[PDB]
């Protein structure tokens, strides 16, 4: 996260860290006792499922905490439509090897329904342990960063991405995506944040409006972050989890 601030422990208790061979690579969001949502691009086919872990209940990734829990994955289910970088369907369901116990520091985030509207300009928050500027890692002990960002419609976002664009790049915000950030940049999600939550306030609650997906260099002007809309996958997520692991 660039241009944000450190959260305090427990503030975003659905935020998880996903590591591959022990290195944090992506964020995710806890959505039940055994399932996390992240981005499909975080799980390329050539990676080995047994080399992933998910750390929940963490605030400072480098610090020991008795509240944090680390799990491996039983299943990685990318959306079938995810074809390649920039594609629709950049979302994955991850089933933890074993269920966790919710606590003060580990709690799921509510998912929106298929037609949930989050209006333009709503101030949501993106969180993560990603880079704090392009090519600059968050410094140890790596406290979770948070950043308040207004939602930017995909239409506005597509117009902004066209400004001074490289013609060979599609930079196309799809129908299943929304943006959030600032036309003048400076504040955005970066590499290492992808897969993580865009948490939006609604009626006193928080919903997972988006999953951090892609963008150009974080904090560049006219290049707000692009997020996969959870509402676009509400039906699929509910069908998949209900068939695979119904709540008894
Ligand atoms: N938000 C941007 N402008 N860039 C950006 C870079 C990487 C990821 C995934 O890690 C998300 C967004």
From Swiss-Prot:
Sites where a glycan is attached: 115
EC number(s) on file: 3.4.21.-
Disulfide bridge partners, by residue number: 26-42, 124-200, 157-179, 190-218
Enzyme class, UniProt record, top EC level: hydrolase
Residue ranges constituting the Peptidase S1 domain according to the UniProt record: 1-242
Keyword Secreted: yes
Gene Ontology MF terms in the entry: serine-type endopeptidase activity; serine-type peptidase activity
Source domain of life: Eukaryota
Keywords: Cell membrane, Disulfide bond, Glycoprotein, Hydrolase, Membrane, Protease, Secreted, Serine protease, Signal, Transmembrane, Transmembrane helix, Zymogen
Protein name stated in the entry: Prostasin
Origin species: Homo sapiens (Human)
Portion of the full sequence shown: 45 to 292 of 343
């Amino acid at each position: 996260i660039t241009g944000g601030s450190s959260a305090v422990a427990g503030q975003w208790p659905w935020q998880v860290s996903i590591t591959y061979e022990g290195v944090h690579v992506c964020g995710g969001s806890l959505v039940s006792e055994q399932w996390v949502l992240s981005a499909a691009h975080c799980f390329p086919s050539e990676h080995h499922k047994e080399a992933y872990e998910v750390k929940l209940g963490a605030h400072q990734l480098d610090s020991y905490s008795e509240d944090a829990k680390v799990s491996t994955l039983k299943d990685i289910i990318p959306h079938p439509s995810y074809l390649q970088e920039g594609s629709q369907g950049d979302i994955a369901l991850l089933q933890l090897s074993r269920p966790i116990t919710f606590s003060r520091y580990i709690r799921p985030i509510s998912l929106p329904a298929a037609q949930a509207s989050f209006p333009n300009g709503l101030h949501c928050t993106v969180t993560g342990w990603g880079h704090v500027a392009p090519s600059v890692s968050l410094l140890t002990p790596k406290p979770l960063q948070q950043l308040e960002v207004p939602l930017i419609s995909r239409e506005t976002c597509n117009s902004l991405y066209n400004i001074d664009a490289k013609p060979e790049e599609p930079h196309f915000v799809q129908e299943d995506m929304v943006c959030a950030g600032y036309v003048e940049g400076g504040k955005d999600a970066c590499q290492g944040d992808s897969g993580g939550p865009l948490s939006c306030p609604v009626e006193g609650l928080w919903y997972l409006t988006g999953i951090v997906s892609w963008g150009d260099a974080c904090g560049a002007r006219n290049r707000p972050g692009v997020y996969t809309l959870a509402s676009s996958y509400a039906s699929w997520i509910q069908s998949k989890v209900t068939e695979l692991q119904p709540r008894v």
